[PDB]
Symmetry: D2
Subunit: 470 residues, 4 copies
């Protein structure tokens, strides 16, 4: 049962909009909206969206596996060894938010302060003492972006696994000699850094020039979560405010995906006339180029929606019905919708590129979609006795208690996969968890969970006190 | 009763090192060390210090008032109007961590997300609705460092007040016309930005070329907290680890100040031979140029301690007894003391330049000295009934309740001064508070509070859980 | 008769290597090597080449016209109006080295000091007084590279004409309103800058992703000058020194073009066995990325010559027979050939990117190929009486003499085309001419002209004296 | 007889303004204006000046020797060895425009292409073969500004000699060990780069914070050329155009120096009332910060001429009588004087910072003052038989002829000093000479030479032809 199986299972259920049905439904962890900072929904005048992994949630592990297969084929195509073709995507290995260390070829799971929680070289999980040889302070300077790449998006899951596959392959293949910073193949030296760059270039290529979009579109049921409650929620948002789309994707792909998401034999509710997807939006903007979008952005362009091509020149005209924009900036949206930042709830999955930046640069309110949560919550609740035991051990300590703390930490983490929970390793929170807490005002496995809260719900979080205030 | 009066009052008391006396003493809020993240003192092998406002705590309001007077005299000297001489420093106005908005000439108190808590133009406190004219989203992008300057150090307190004095003066002086972005004096236009730059340049000048150091040194009792417990604590640190000084100050000033701090007719304890200040340190480094010190730094130089001048050339030799370094980097210290980052507790008052950067760039453990806490804690405890009432009102709301929330917020904040508490405005935490929580592992009004904890105390903070984990 | 007609006519003649035949041949202007600075050929130990417009001289106007047609089709493909398809390339309009002013949409012919010699808006040639409205000092700051783009390569000839076509078209098409900085089409504004960027992007696209290479290769006789004397000269160079190729082109294209250039039923001389092109080179380097090549460059890679693909990794091995390199730097070449800069004569057509940079960054000796010279020399000699008259008029002046100076200047310049000579407008030298003089030690219409000078000829230029020395 | 002795000798003569007297006078090389590009004086509407070494020509070697002595004393003051005090300035060593190579501690005389003409390590002149060890191609990349500093100003003459003194001293002092890149003094290493930086900092300090200005002003007759013809020429300029001053110096120093330059008991001519220096200028601008002045510049300020201090704020008012500006940009001047670039003849000594930049960035006409020319011309004419012989030898060659070419080159060069002529070494022109030719439209030992040409003289230079045009 993947996280997308959980989401699609919930998507298949029709909305019971009886007020008591809603009240009962959103008590369950799975259908809840989680609150980091209080948010009065009555003050929200605009609802904004990203598309990929927000409105269009790609099914797991099928979509990662397709990305993986195409990336592999691209690398083989440019001259990587044929053995790569015998790799197969393994959803049990990667967790999102790992750091690739390009100097030593390791995947690292870190906390908010750069402290190492997990280190794997290929598929070899390196224990505490052996990590000190390369990381004397069990620490990395994560701002050293030439050396460290943080694999923070769901699109990075296939390359997270591929990097490990490649390091493993080259290490165990007799044709290469393993060196501290890469591999020697006679008079050729392949650094982990150049290998990483090839992978990164190949993923980019697959998305922008290769066949990933085409293969997705030719089998949308296989690859994309579909939920009849999507149109209903968007219609309800539009009754109390404005709705916009701001996506990095191009118009043609956006139109294919969105048409599929709205292709039901009815509109918002069963029995209603079907309406085109575009009618759900007061403003539609593609080719957004976030995160730059939240600063200077790029020039505002107009999409010719017949051809899918941009009209020539900068668009100087007003917001009108049926217009589709390309590029622009976050100010374009504010100014055309007559919104201030705090009037906007921006809904997306990119914890850095969208949520962090819209919050820091513009003061937008934020809703982070975390697809993996839909399954992480089942593990958290089913194995709560492991975490509870770990808590008790840390308490009792505060000798063989440490050994047992390590063992329980391991067993807990393995329930989530080889790289553990997205949010922690044992009692230590990940960088990703800290970023969610700091920059996502609200979060959930799906933004559909908003459907279960009344129009002007007050989402509440407790006031924060400093230690000397407590 | 200033914060420095509280600290000097505590400094006058001799240390009772009976273990039960210590236990009882550190229960009191005033003598406590506060914990943001757990820290096992047994793992600390090196103790590092800044000098200014850490070891050498300048008395308030006397030192701010001297800074202020000299800055004013410098501005008059370069052609500012004579009326500046009638300003007098007022400790009741400034709170540390305010933002000067150089576009509109306002002082702003902000939260961690750039939301406006307080806005004053000169001495006019601007209410919610009027702030929207200049700040439509009640928000500033604090990363816009060309526009916004954050007055985060205790050395910035005089200029915080001076900026307000100047805006007030120019606004109410008939010779000038008030404009949106500055003042017109016939064919001269003085922008708030250029005015700010003059102030900033003048403060710098007073410290580096003017008479501030000289006047401080000619009356150290007036200007500098002195505490016989300082040598005792440093001696105790040195029994379990190494001790170092890394200060931006030059050798001559450092020597004058440190000699005074250690000038008692005894060494660590009464009855012991007096020892020179330098004997308390395994490594002494001046001209550190933090924050750059925590990255590339500058070349390592050696101080000729007779002349106070640098020897010519880069120092390539070992750590030896009696050597004093200048410049270098944080790695110099680690490598010469044989320390990893997490072995080091770095003790300082600069929440950005030292504490934040040593934590993020190097993984050092951090102790933040917050001198104002020594008095903020007395206000917090004495007026706890106001905060408690505010908490109850926010709870009851969660109409005239809002009015009462505003009124109680005002009354609470005024107990701290016109710009309120360093740490909050009513129930909203400041940027400064959020930074302390995030980057200071431990904090206190004085690092002397460490004297009251046993050698290998385990400072404890509760594990953090995400909302979905709770 | 184009310049390439002259070159191909000379290419069809077999080499008469009798010493007196050579002596007589190189007296003629057409077969001469011109000398800016003295160069002792005996000191040259290595001969280096670019490919495009150096070894592979593309026939005119056929190749420009193909570039033009494909660029137009690309612009129409992305949404430019259908009318573009009625443009036809006109070799009489463009001269190389014009500056496009992206602010006002003008093509400018300038001297070395940025003084305006010619200004055309579309096809309207703007006279002295009207140019002052936009250029008050009849001057541009050519270092302002955001505003001014210098069209310095032979590959830029089609876009030089296209830019003028487009400005003309948009100006005279009633659907658009002409503005100072571009064109208004209702709610779309197309700046000359964005229009220029589209053109530049389209040219790039045609070369890198479109069909230009494919169409060239499918008709090499139509598009590429071929000369049996090429192998003979290269063989002679190789008898006295080393020979290398350093080209920005990729291996597959290089191999196609070079195979054609050497496809004769003989080797260096008639009667000799044919040898593969690669055997003429001690070192072959593709994907050079000049001008960066002359500084840091990129990592050295090895080409797999069977597949045309790069081997994976950085190449760490020695120079060996049959190896083909990709990327690297100018130091790679020096170090592998055991050459110092002044031992190298580098032969190319790119007056900036190759000749200027190899001279300034490395001190290489330089030979600039200027294909247009092959016809400019015929005009210069045939219309020498116009220049001579202009000289006499400038002398006589040093009233209606000025009028006559303008008229004769016009008539002279029109012999070369609408944008005049590459090297001057009347008595005023172009920027291009000044750059040739300053950075090309030797120059000619073709490097084949070296065949007519003995092995160790001393190319002589007179010593330069300052005015006070004269 | 120094160059300033020649200039002061010519300054002592009263102007004979009879037209035939002028005609005869300007035939002599010493009183001539030399022409690189033709310049019609009738088109000049504004005459602009720098002060230092243009209007105020500092006497040699006295002023260099004062600079030297103060720089030495500053270095000793910061801890350089006492032996420095035994150095004495030697005008026979330095020539202007040498390059200090900070890696190897050499002074280099180079041509326009970076080819080495002379290399000295301390006072050891390194011969051809030994220079190849450090300079394998007898070439430096002069754009590598971290490594190479070009000593292009007359203010750099003392440090040119001091650098050589220091390298010599450290090399021959047994306390230090000479290394490839500097000197070892036990556990201190002083790189040539750090030594160079100390020197450069000390020169700056002497000018800006030390006693150089004060000592100059207390003996202006000793230090500054004074010429009664200065006011006469400026008065004549003002009859046909506008006159301005744009100097990097501050107002107080400018006023002291200019008052001295105009302190005669008469105005422009004997018998006329004395007029203040400021009355000779339509616009006076100090604190210019050239070269930045020729781009964005700094804000325009107004000098309070009573106090010598800047008024507070940016000056927004018109040009008026008696106003003195500070900062600004070259556009300020153009706009306030109603001039286009080519209307301006800018007169200065800084071949880079003023002449080059005003020409390239703005298209100003340029007059370069080269004080040393006043004596270089006497050497050139007196030893013309050496140059003539060298010319004949280069011709005859074009064996022992080379030996004789080297010997004659040496003997010629030694007539100018140990570092030879500013303009050449034997038949090879220096970088400095090439820059003068390229960027100075006119040049002379003194701008006073303009007094000998009629109001609207046409300065003529021959048209330049390319080799293929000749
Ligand atoms: Mg997305
Ligand atoms: Mg401090
Ligand atoms: Mg080429
Ligand atoms: Mg000067």
């Amino acid at each position: 049962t993947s996280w997308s199986d959980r989401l699609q299972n919930a998507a298949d259920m029709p909305a019971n909009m009886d007020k008591h049905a809603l009240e009962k439904y959103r008590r369950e962890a799975y259908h809840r909206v989680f609150v980091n900072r209080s948010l009065a929904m009555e003050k929200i005048k605009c609802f904004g969206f990203d598309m990929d992994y927000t409105l269009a949630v790609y099914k797991s592990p099928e979509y990662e596996s397709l990305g993986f297969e195409l990336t592999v084929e691209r690398l083989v195509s440019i001259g990587y060894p044929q053995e790569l073709l015998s790799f197969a995507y393994d959803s049990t290995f990667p967790t999102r938010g790992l750091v690739f260390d390009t100097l030593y070829g390791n995947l690292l799971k870190v906390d908010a302060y750069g402290n190492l929680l997990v280190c794997a070289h290929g598929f070899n999980f390196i224990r505490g003492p052996e990590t000190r040889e390369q990381y004397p302070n069990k620490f990395i300077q994560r701002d050293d972006t030439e050396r460290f790449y943080i694999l923070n998006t769901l699109f990075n899951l296939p390359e997270t696994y591929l990097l490990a596959c490649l390091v493993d392959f080259f290490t165990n293949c007799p044709r290469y000699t393993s060196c501290e910073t890469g591999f020697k193949d006679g008079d050729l030296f392949m650094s982990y850094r150049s290998m990483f760059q090839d992978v990164r270039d190949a993923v980019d290529w697959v998305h922008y020039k290769g066949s990933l979009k085409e293969k997705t579109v030719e089998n949308l049921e296989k690859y994309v979560v579909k939920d009849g409650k999507l149109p209903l929620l968007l219609s309800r948002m539009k009754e109390v405010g404005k709705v916009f789309l701001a996506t990095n994707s191009d118009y043609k792909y956006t139109d294919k995906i969105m048409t599929y998401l709205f292709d039901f034999p009815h509109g918002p509710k069963p029995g209603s006339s079907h309406r085109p997807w575009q009618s759900y939006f007061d403003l539609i903007l593609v080719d957004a180029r976030k995160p730059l979008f939240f600063g200077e952005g790029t020039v505002l362009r107009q999409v010719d929606t017949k051809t899918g091509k941009l009209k020539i020149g900068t668009y100087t005209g007003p917001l009108q019905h049926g217009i589709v924009y390309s590029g622009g900036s976050s100010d374009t949206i504010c100014d055309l919708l007559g919104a201030k930042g705090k009037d906007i709830l921006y809904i997306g999955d990119h914890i850095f590129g969208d949520i962090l930046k819209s919050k820091k640069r513009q003061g937008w309110r934020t809703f982070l979609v975390i697809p993996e949560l839909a399954q992480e919550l089942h593990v958290w609740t089913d194995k709560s006795s492991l975490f509870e035991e770990l808590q008790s051990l840390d308490i009792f300590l505060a000798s063989s208690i440490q050994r047992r703390i390590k063992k329980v930490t391991h067993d807990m983490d393995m329930c989530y996969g080889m790289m553990g929970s997205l949010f922690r390793s044992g009692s230590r929170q990940t960088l990703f968890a800290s970023q969610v807490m700091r920059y996502a005002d609200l979060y959930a496995a799906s933004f559909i969970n908003l459907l279960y809260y009344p129009f002007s719900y007050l989402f509440r979080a407790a006031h924060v006190l400093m230690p000397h205030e407590s």
